Design a binder for these strands. Structure first.
Length: 348
RNA sequence: GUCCCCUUCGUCUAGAGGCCCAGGACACCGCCCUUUCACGGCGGUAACAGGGGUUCGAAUCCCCUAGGGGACGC
């Protein structure tokens, strides 16, 4: 009877994730992946602590806890890139890669080819649904908690092999079952790799106003960091990063979480992925997410072409950041998405 | 060198003799929110240019010592 390997972080949703499967009658063993080779004694004092919790649980459930080291697949397939997008002055979402490259590939392939597994599972608050012959990626009760956003690259081929159980409950349940079952500095880090190339801050009306320490240290919409005190203008409202001039190492800023140069009408996504691996052409009426936990925003998606897509919002949106992922949903169905290449600014 | 006006938390500033062991804002620090970077919510630190005077009381009044505007310097 079906053996499913559930990766454990020593978390809680991975824990209750295993117990659920087990309770469903699966030969379920656990796997603890290690994707980074420590550098800080501060780092070890964490993984260690996860491993421990990882193990500690598996005992309580009575399942075998395995171990793999994808620390290299990681470095190459997601850390290289990760850094490379900051070089272009973009703001990448490293986790979208960690899933696509590791969690649902490295682990996926391993668990089957080695750990001899029928299915793979994980602590994602997401739901799977095989309908009309093909598996789909869904939200999972309590949309305020859905994490489908990070698994937009997956493919039915992958969805089918995976098993997302915790997504069928309301998150409150999870955290609880776990108890009733007696169970469970970014700026600095970047510096350990990227050199600071200090430039100068300028306002929307081009006015010397501050420095950088780097341009990889800011993202559109980012408030904290600048260090500005307003004067004969500013309306006192805080300052927000509105643009980044990579070529000129110029950081443009503005004022008012509602300033017109922080708003956009749409965007252009490329590096697309549609869960049903069916290429998109034409036009569609769906909804999008520019950043995690961001509320759904209705839109009109126009099949620009090939792999390029033209998304048209229904109301100007906040900080659309090129380099961030764009996920489209059709109800409970996560359809797919791509990486935001261009922002479509507000008509001047 | 002819005589008019400013000088406060990091920043821009309120105050207008006691309500000021000085307020707001932006910054910053912390916490929370969070499977990315952010946003946001909460909270917190910190200042009256120097010297005198007058007052029971001065940030608040006057007085000179320092730093920024006033159609002669022909």
């Amino acid at each position: 009877a079906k053996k499913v390997i559930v990766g454990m972080s020593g978390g809680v949703d991975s824990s209750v994730s295993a117990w659920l499967l087990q309770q469903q009658g699966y030969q379920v063993e656990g796997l603890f992946m290690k994707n980074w080779e420590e550098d800080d004694g501060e780092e070890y004092c964490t993984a260690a602590a996860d491993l421990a919790d990882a193990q500690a649980v598996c005992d309580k459930l009575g399942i075998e806890l395995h171990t793999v080291n994808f620390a290299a697949e990681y470095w190459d397939n997601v850390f290289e890139l990760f850094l490379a997008e900051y070089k272009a002055g973009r703001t990448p979402n490293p986790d979208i890669l960690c899933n696509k490259e590791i969690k649902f590939k490295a682990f996926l392939e391993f668990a089957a080819e080695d750990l001899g597994a029928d299915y793979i599972a994980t602590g994602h608050y997401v739901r799977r649904a095989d309908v009309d012959g093909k598996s789909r990626l869904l939200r999972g009760l309590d949309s305020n908690k859905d994490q489908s956003y990070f698994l937009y690259t997956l493919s039915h081929e992958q969805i089918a092999q995976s098993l997302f159980p915790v997504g069928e409950l309301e998150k409150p349940q999870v955290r609880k079952i776990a108890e009733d079952l007696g169970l469970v500095k970014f700026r600095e880090f970047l510096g350990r790799y990227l050199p600071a190339q200090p430039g100068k801050i300028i306002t929307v009306d081009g006015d010397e106003i501050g420095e950088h320490q780097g341009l990889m240290y800011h993202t559109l919409g980012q408030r904290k960091g600048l260090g500005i005190g307003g004067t004969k203008e500013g309306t006192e409202e805080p300052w927000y990063v509105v643009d980044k001039d990579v070529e000129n190492n110029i950081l443009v800023v503005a004022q008012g979480h509602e300033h017109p140069r922080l708003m956009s009408v749409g965007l252009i996504a490329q590096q697309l992925h549609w869960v049903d691996r069916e290429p998109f052409t034409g036009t569609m009426r769906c909804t999008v997410k520019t950043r995690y936990r961001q509320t759904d925003i209705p839109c009109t998606v126009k099949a620009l072409d090939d792999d390029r897509i033209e998304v048209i919002f229904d109301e100007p949106v906040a900080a659309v950041t090129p380099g961030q992922s764009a996920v489209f949903y059709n109800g409970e169905v996560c359809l797919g998405g791509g990486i935001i290449e261009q922002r479509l600014p507000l008509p001047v």
